[PDB]
Design a protein around this ligand. Structure first.
Ligand SMILES: Nc1ncnc2c1ncn2[C@@H]1O[C@H](CSCC[C@H](N)C(=O)O)[C@@H](O)[C@H]1O
Length: 327
DNA sequence: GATAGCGCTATC
DNA sequence: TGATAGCGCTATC
């Protein structure tokens, strides 16, 4: 994550819904905002959240009386996506895990926050031809908020990962927020190879497999893109190998394949999966953040998490706009 | 709870 | 197209 000196969000209070690892907190907090409430029903996730922020998130948001949610200026929420991902049964709103947005809508209706910050996968935009997004746009407009949606890729904001996500920023209409913008992209000056751990610490993750084919030669020069070198087995999800000289593929939560949730990378003639912390970094997390003890849960957590760095640039601009109140 | 084979589907 | 991908889904122990 990036260090920020102009705390645009100072004095503001925010809510951390669907917290998971707490990435949204890390972001807004770096900009001077204050976290007043957090919600996350997964046991193990609460464990890491606690492990890193003291408190322990509250349970099932679908059964929390919104009247109970603390006063707050910005509502943060990266809601479930198994329901809209390019990688699943796009059952959208029909899927139980795909209704959570409306839970948000009723948190917003009651607490009427100044800003509504949401995150989800790229597919969300076009899912169901584009009606799902539309339902969210109108629901927000009908709640009297503006709707600023755009998809950004992590590799355009200082982090080596081809992770494209849809970011939705909502300002209450009262305030005439009309100068808000999404961070402009910029040169990628860091690659997988730069975030790795010494072989001394990865040995255990190396996977030698006879069925390891090799369809592309290692690259010498770094690229702001993921480059597939080899493959194992049938070459499906988590069976693909990439050049650490480029950028990492998207991390996933319920992912499979021998290189489950991280993907295979070629390091010094060997083929292996990333380390819980190599992920942490790949996701923009400061090495000072304590990961969950259960490696599996760890990978799962960073899987649906958010790239801290990205949220920062957005969070910064949210404040920039909020703080512009001329006479 | 931890593993791992997979079987579509975005997109260009 | 033909090649690459994906906050996923499942079964098995
Ligand atoms: N009803 C519910 N109540 C609380 N959390 C829920 C929930 N349904 C899903 N979730 C949680 O939704 C989260 C979506 S992933 C969001 C990740 C988060 N922005 C981060 O940075 O870690 C998951 O952690 C999942 O456990």
């Amino acid at each position: 994550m990036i260090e920020i000196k102009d705390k645009q969000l100072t004095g503001l209070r925010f809510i951390d819904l669907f917290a998971g690892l707490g990435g949204f907190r890390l972001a807004l907090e770096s900009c001077g905002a204050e976290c007043v409430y957090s919600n996350e029903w997964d046991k193990y996730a609460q464990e890491v959240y606690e492990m890193n922020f003291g408190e322990k998130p509250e349970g099932d948001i679908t059964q929390v009386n919104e009247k109970t949610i603390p006063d707050h200026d910005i509502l943060c929420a990266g809601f479930p996506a198994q329901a809209f991902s390019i990688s699943g049964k796009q059952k959208g709103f029909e899927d139980s895990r795909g209704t959570l947005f409306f839970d948000i809508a009723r948190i917003v209706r009651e607490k009427k926050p100044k800003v509504v910050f949401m995150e989800n996968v790229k597919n969300f935009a076009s899912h169901d031809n584009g009606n799902t997004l539309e339902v969210v746009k109108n629901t927000m407009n009908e709640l009297d908020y503006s709707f600023h949606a755009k998809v950004l890729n992590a590799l355009d904001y200082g982090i080596p990962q081809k992770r494209e996500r849809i970011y939705m920023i909502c300002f209450r209409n009262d305030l005439n927020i009309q100068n808000f913008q999404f961070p402009k992209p910029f040169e990628l000056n860091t690659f997988v190879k730069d975030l790795l751990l010494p072989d001394s610490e990865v040995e255990h993750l190396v996977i030698d497999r006879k069925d390891l084919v090799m369809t592309n030669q290692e690259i010498e020069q770094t690229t702001p893109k993921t480059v597939r070198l080899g493959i194992v087995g049938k070459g499906g999800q988590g069976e693909r190998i990439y050049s650490t000289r480029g950028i990492a593929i998207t991390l996933s939560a319920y992912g499979g394949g021998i290189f489950a949730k991280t993907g295979g990378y070629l390091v010094n003639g060997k083929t292996r999966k990333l380390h819980p912390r190599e992920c942490a970094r790949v996701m923009g997390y400061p090495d000072s953040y304590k990961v969950h003890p259960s490696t599996s849960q760890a990978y799962k957590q960073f899987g649906n998490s958010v790239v801290i760095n990205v949220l920062q640039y957005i969070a910064y601009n949210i404040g920039s706009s909020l703080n512009f109140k001329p006479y």
